[PDB]
Amino acid sequence: AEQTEKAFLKQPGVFLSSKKTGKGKRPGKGGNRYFKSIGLGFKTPREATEGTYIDKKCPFTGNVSIRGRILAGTCHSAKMNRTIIVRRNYLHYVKKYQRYEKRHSNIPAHISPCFRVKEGDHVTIGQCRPLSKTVRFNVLKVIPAGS
Amino acid sequence: ARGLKKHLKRLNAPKHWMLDKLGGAFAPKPSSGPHKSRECLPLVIILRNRLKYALTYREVISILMQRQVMVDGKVRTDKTYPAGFMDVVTIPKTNESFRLLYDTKGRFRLHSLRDEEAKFKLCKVRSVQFGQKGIPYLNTYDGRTIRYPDPLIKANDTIKLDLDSNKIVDFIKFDVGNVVMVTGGRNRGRVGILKNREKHKGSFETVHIQDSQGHEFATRLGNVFTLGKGSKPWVSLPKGKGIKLSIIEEARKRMAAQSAT
Amino acid sequence: GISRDSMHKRRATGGKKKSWRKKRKYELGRQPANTKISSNKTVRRIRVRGGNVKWRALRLDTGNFSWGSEAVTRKTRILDVVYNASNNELVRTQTLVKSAIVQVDAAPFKQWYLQHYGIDISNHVVRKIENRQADRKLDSHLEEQFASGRLLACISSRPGQCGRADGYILEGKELEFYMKKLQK
Amino acid sequence: MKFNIANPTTGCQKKLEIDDDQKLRAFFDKRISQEVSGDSLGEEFKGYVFKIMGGCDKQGFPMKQGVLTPGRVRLLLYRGTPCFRGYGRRNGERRRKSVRGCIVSPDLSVLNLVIVKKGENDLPGLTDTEKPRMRGPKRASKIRKLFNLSKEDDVRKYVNTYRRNFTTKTGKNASKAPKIQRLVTPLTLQRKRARIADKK
RNA sequence: GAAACUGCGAAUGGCUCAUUAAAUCAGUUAUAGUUUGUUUGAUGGUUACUCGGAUAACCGUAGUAAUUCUAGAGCUAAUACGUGCACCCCGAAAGGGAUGCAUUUAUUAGAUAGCGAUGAUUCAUGAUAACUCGACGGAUCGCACGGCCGCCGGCGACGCAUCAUUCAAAUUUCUGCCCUAUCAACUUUCGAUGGUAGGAUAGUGGCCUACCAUGGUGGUGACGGGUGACGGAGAAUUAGGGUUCGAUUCCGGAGAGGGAGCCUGAGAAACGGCUA
Numbered sequence A: 001a002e003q004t005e006k007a008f009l010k011q012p013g014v015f016l017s018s019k020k021t022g023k024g025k026r027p028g029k030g031g032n033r034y035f036k037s038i039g040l041g042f043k044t045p046r047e048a049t050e051g052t053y054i055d056k057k058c059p060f061t062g063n064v065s066i067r068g069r070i071l072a073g074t075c076h077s078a079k080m081n082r083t084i085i086v087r088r089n090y091l092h093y094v095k096k097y098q099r100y101e102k103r104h105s106n107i108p109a110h111i112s113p114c115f116r117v118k119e120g121d122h123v124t125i126g127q128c129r130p131l132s133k134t135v136r137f138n139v140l141k142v143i144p145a146g147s
Numbered sequence B: 001a002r003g004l005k006k007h008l009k010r011l012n013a014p015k016h017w018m019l020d021k022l023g024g025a026f027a028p029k030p031s032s033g034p035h036k037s038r039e040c041l042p043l044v045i046i047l048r049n050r051l052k053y054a055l056t057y058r059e060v061i062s063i064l065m066q067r068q069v070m071v072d073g074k075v076r077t078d079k080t081y082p083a084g085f086m087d088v089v090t091i092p093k094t095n096e097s098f099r100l101l102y103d104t105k106g107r108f109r110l111h112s113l114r115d116e117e118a119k120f121k122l123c124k125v126r127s128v129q130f131g132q133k134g135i136p137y138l139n140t141y142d143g144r145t146i147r148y149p150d151p152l153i154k155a156n157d158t159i160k161l162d163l164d165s166n167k168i169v170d171f172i173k174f175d176v177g178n179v180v181m182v183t184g185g186r187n188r189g190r191v192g193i194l195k196n197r198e199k200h201k202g203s204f205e206t207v208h209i210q211d212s213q214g215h216e217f218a219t220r221l222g223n224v225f226t227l228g229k230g231s232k233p234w235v236s237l238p239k240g241k242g243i244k245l246s247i248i249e250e251a252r253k254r255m256a257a258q259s260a261t
Numbered sequence C: 001g002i003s004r005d006s007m008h009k010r011r012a013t014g015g016k017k018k019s020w021r022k023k024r025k026y027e028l029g030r031q032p033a034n035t036k037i038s039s040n041k042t043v044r045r046i047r048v049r050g051g052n053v054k055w056r057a058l059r060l061d062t063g064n065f066s067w068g069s070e071a072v073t074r075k076t077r078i079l080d081v082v083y084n085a086s087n088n089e090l091v092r093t094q095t096l097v098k099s100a101i102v103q104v105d106a107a108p109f110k111q112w113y114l115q116h117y118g119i120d121i122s123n124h125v126v127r128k129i130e131n132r133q134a135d136r137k138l139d140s141h142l143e144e145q146f147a148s149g150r151l152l153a154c155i156s157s158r159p160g161q162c163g164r165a166d167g168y169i170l171e172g173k174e175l176e177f178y179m180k181k182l183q184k
Numbered sequence D: 001m002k003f004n005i006a007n008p009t010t011g012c013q014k015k016l017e018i019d020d021d022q023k024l025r026a027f028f029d030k031r032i033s034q035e036v037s038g039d040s041l042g043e044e045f046k047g048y049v050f051k052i053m054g055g056c057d058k059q060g061f062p063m064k065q066g067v068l069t070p071g072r073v074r075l076l077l078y079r080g081t082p083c084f085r086g087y088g089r090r091n092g093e094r095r096r097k098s099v100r101g102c103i104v105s106p107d108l109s110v111l112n113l114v115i116v117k118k119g120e121n122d123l124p125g126l127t128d129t130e131k132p133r134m135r136g137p138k139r140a141s142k143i144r145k146l147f148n149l150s151k152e153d154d155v156r157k158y159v160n161t162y163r164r165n166f167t168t169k170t171g172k173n174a175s176k177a178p179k180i181q182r183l184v185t186p187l188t189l190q191r192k193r194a195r196i197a198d199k200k
Numbered sequence E: 001g002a003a004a005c006u007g008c009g010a011a012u013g014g015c016u017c018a019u020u021a022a023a024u025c026a027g028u029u030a031u032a033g034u035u036u037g038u039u040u041g042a043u044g045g046u047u048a049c050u051c052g053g054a055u056a057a058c059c060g061u062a063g064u065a066a067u068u069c070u071a072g073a074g075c076u077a078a079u080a081c082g083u084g085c086a087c088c089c090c091g092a093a094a095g096g097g098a099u100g101c102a103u104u105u106a107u108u109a110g111a112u113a114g115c116g117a118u119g120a121u122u123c124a125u126g127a128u129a130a131c132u133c134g135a136c137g138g139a140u141c142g143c144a145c146g147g148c149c150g151c152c153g154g155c156g157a158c159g160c161a162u163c164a165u166u167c168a169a170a171u172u173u174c175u176g177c178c179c180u181a182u183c184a185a186c187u188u189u190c191g192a193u194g195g196u197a198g199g200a201u202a203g204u205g206g207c208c209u210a211c212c213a214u215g216g217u218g219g220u221g222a223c224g225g226g227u228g229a230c231g232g233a234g235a236a237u238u239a240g241g242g243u244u245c246g247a248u249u250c251c252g253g254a255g256a257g258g259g260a261g262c263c264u265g266a267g268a269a270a271c272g273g274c275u276a
């Protein structure tokens, strides 16, 4: 199961030992798995509404809100645990020569288990509160490379 | 800094105060109050620079310490009290009463009022939410809190506030077709009819306003202030009536004035 | 003193950060409470930013614990720390921290259970007690530990912050998870 | 070594200078707040008991209670505590100052003594005349306690007892009495009624 | 009305440019990630005709070469200090428990398309079970005197608590900086990158600890070195493009001989504050 840490992982506020049943109640009530919509026109993946993973940094089932800048880029590194490096490619204008030069920036981003990603896939990231020393973004959508 | 700044350098003061740059090193630092320091007119500016009743900083203190000036019906003795948009300033000895409104060039104008019209003001609703004990309340953009508001009132609406009963007399819902004034930005002081509302999820909402002469300008929702339902404002406007003239048109009037005057 | 600034850290690239200012008071830390289980209760009052107050518990012996399924909360004595997911050294030192698994006295909950269900683990009174006994269900794992007089509980408060050690009684799959960690 | 002898019951005080080491052996090794018999201090002090309150060393540094040494140490003191007056200094400001220990030793330059029990012959200028208190009670409850007044008995009629009369160099007559504090008057009851009225 | 206690302020201003090269800083964001004396608005339950003990000024014994260095004794105040009137459960439906506000935890409601808001929150807020050894819920002051037959009552001042507001800070998103490769690899045992659980913090965060994973950056120049490098608004010269400068009065940052540490406080790692 998802219980792989030393502590028991669960969603905060979802009581799992209630005598009554959760049939007919909203998410997060009656022991039902909690999930939410982040707004801005983004859809909640089926893997997050019907999954069993526990991720307090997940934008759909965790305790983090999306607000600020929405960016897009390509998955550059997917070797960390639930974190990827997103490469953003842009052109910098060199004024004196009236021409452009290619630049890039690597943006660390948290990716919830509901998303599948590989190097080269296109990802959309939304800003959230600091999740670690460098992570300030959460993956909101993944488009497989060549699609 | 290790805390709060108590001084305002004269060149850093808001431009709409129209302070001369060589008048001194400092400008009046607006006190905390209902309006923001960048969107207000301290009483010292009003009494000395606009009305000329006081000739110096010292004389403004004498006037206020005699309890001769009232803002929104209450006596104020703070020289840097931040009087702002729609505030009613009353001076019983001179029998005068003004409303702070923007002229079409974006500067505060002391619009003389009649004794009857000086008994109320307009306020923009900031938000409506439940307070302690589940009691609903609304707060405005002039720092006021009203409990038990009408359930129909929502954010960005305008309420007519009676300065005697201190109660909501009537309100205007924020909707397309009403007459509004711009209270911030490039178009500050312009009056028109709200024609459209463009919402952008997560971003600022833009509102397209059309002047009475067909001139259309946009601005942010935060800079709009509904003045009346339909096309007639609930308050008296200055002579320009929020009509912004081009520099060419303004020069045309000035030329004609010299010929006649 | 203890500081929470990032100036002493390496950059994400790995390069060093040359110091450009001294430590600020608004980024300070403080010594940990290291709350222990002891009958000599001691909570010291700490003045924090804004003139507000924090309560730092050095020693505690009782806590306010809630039986979630029964929706009953009682003050009870803390008996022992049995498991800690962060550091096993906090178990043998009997340190009270949030999310630590502890054993609490079962006596206060037994009294409520007898007063509520009329069971050990006045005409109108017996009318309702039997009525409540129809929908009475007690987990076998939860009942087995009432005989010993101790209930496994999880601390949900932060004793070093609020000065208290409150929690809830373990039950369901959470109880199964931790009792398997203690089965050695 | 000098001695500052004070008589709390009488309000009088006097300085005594003694140079006989054999007579000072009674005080040496004593600590603050400990009592010393005046028999060996002299003949006129027979039957007198003195309490050691403190003193200053030959460099003027004061003795501090609790410093269980005969020498000088440096302590970080708070304002207003003994050995650190801290006048004109910031609130919360601490200072490191030199303080002599609490154990009496020949290194002291003066000792402050309090007569806790008088002997046979009354000392001249210490137990002969009683100096009156400069000021009488000012709080209402203390005036009633002083004169054993009751709840119904008026208190403002007794402050005239210790009213101070005198003549000014430029005038002829002048009397002064204290203002009674915590005195229940019609105005105080009016304030209480108004405060309750506001709540309703 | 001196003095003195109490209160507040002294964290602004002024000065300077040493350190500092994605850092400061600029435009642009975010706080649903926090604190905020004051101002302004609103809001605070159904011995008491008023408690207690101290202390200053003052008074008078002083010490030391000496300092807003200092000891002892006698007095007396408070808006100082310490106190204190001030629906649910059990149940022989009597009686009892809890019953303000705040604090801490848990259960529960917060719909639908009686029932509020958002682009978005188990959010605002409600109810319930308990919890805390809670600087909270006025032992204060001025002026004016009136109306009822002792009762009632006016206009102010100051103060406590909560929310909103204002004044702000802290942290923070995106993009942007001079020369140097005779600097090509750098980071990671002792945090480097990320994960889980805690601790600490006003609060987010390897900020710190335990455990786990092996990541993170780099010819689109990392890392290192140089700067007689604070950044910007701007300044000089300019057909156009450009070159050079920007210590200095506006804004931001930083420092107070060098480091470090800290008290007081709403606010300082303060220096015309303290400790080394």
Ligand SMILES: [K+]
Pocket (backbone or CB within 6 Å): B001, B002, B003
């Ligand atoms: K600052």
Ligand SMILES: [K+]
Pocket (backbone or CB within 6 Å): E009
């Ligand atoms: K201060």
Ligand SMILES: [K+]
Pocket (backbone or CB within 6 Å): E026
């Ligand atoms: K910026």
Ligand SMILES: [K+]
Pocket (backbone or CB within 6 Å): E025, E177
């Ligand atoms: K820059």
Ligand SMILES: [K+]
Pocket (backbone or CB within 6 Å): E201, E203, E204
């Ligand atoms: K934190």
Ligand SMILES: [K+]
Pocket (backbone or CB within 6 Å): none
């Ligand atoms: K972590």
Ligand SMILES: [K+]
Pocket (backbone or CB within 6 Å): E265
């Ligand atoms: K203060």
Ligand SMILES: [Mg+2]
Pocket (backbone or CB within 6 Å): B001
């Ligand atoms: Mg300054």
Ligand SMILES: [Mg+2]
Pocket (backbone or CB within 6 Å): B202
């Ligand atoms: Mg927003």
Ligand SMILES: [Mg+2]
Pocket (backbone or CB within 6 Å): D181, D182
């Ligand atoms: Mg009094």
Ligand SMILES: [Mg+2]
Pocket (backbone or CB within 6 Å): none
């Ligand atoms: Mg003073």
Ligand SMILES: [Mg+2]
Pocket (backbone or CB within 6 Å): E021
């Ligand atoms: Mg360098």
Ligand SMILES: [Mg+2]
Pocket (backbone or CB within 6 Å): E022
């Ligand atoms: Mg950057």
Ligand SMILES: [Mg+2]
Pocket (backbone or CB within 6 Å): none
């Ligand atoms: Mg809630």
Ligand SMILES: [Mg+2]
Pocket (backbone or CB within 6 Å): none
């Ligand atoms: Mg954490």
Ligand SMILES: [Mg+2]
Pocket (backbone or CB within 6 Å): none
């Ligand atoms: Mg570690």
